[PDB]
Amino acid sequence: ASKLRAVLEKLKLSRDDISTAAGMVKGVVDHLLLRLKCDSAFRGVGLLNTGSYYEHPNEFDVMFKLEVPRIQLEEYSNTRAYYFVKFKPLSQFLEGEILSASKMLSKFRKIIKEEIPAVTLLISEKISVDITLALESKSSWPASTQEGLRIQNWLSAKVRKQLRLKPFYLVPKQEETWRLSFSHIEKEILNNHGKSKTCCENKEEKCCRKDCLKLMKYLLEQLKERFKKHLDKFSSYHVKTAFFHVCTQNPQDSQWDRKDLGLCFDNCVTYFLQCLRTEKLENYFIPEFNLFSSNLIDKRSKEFLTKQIEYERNNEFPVFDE
Ligand SMILES: [Zn+2]
């Protein structure tokens, strides 16, 4: 549809500005990586490479991963996503048997501080980088994910098995808990997203999946930008999660034809609206973890965002107007 394509054209205008800043961040990040490598605790550290930039302007997100030897997890309450970690030289942060996140974060923060979720939010001039520490575990994924990643009918059972052989990550968050992270898998599915292995590799198989995700993120950004903080709790992660569920529901590449961009976008919006109304948005990897629970976002805010998105959809997205 013309309006949506005009919006996608407008977003392209900002590409080089994002590009150039990325190389400035990358220079600083490359610089911290080497100094973190000197410290005993962080000697194995490396760059995970994930998030918006890696997937397809002043804000950037970077994850530092650290290989931790044979890990053992303990689920904080019945949270599904939060854990204490223990083992089957990081013993300096051991609270007896349990790895202290705030001990690890304090030194991690101090080293970067010396050099100059999120751990560090740091600055080169008008560049905000969030830097996150992630423990890497090459073990089987925890049981809370056993019913997650429901890609079998879309990306295939074989791909699901291959993805679950990859490591998983833990990011520091009733204190001292770590949360599961699969940002590496999120990037892999967005960049290898078709039922056809050649989806978006030639002119006959251009789908509109990525453009739909971009449009959904831009929709939420624009609605937030209009308010000085009713929508503070909503993030691009909610939009991305909802988008993954919509790919599951529409597994065929022929359901994402570029010429059907308007209909595909409507699908994404209508699903996100359903999530708002039912107050349920399951983490794509951890189904019992409800991103839209009342513990996380009050009923009123969810109700409020429902009204605006409903208004936008019923009037052809005036927020996207010239
Ligand atoms: Zn494609």
Side-chain angles (χ1 to χ4, degrees), residues 193-194 199-200 205 207-209:
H193 55 246
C199 187
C200 289
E205 299 183 73
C207 79
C208 71
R209 291 181 176 92

Side-chain angles (χ1 to χ4, degrees), residues 75-84 144 286 288-290:
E75 181 173 352
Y76 174 82
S77 326
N78 286 308
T79 62
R80 303 304 187 259
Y82 293 90
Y83 295 92
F84 305 106
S144 76
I286 309 159
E288 303 159 272
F289 190 70
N290 183 9

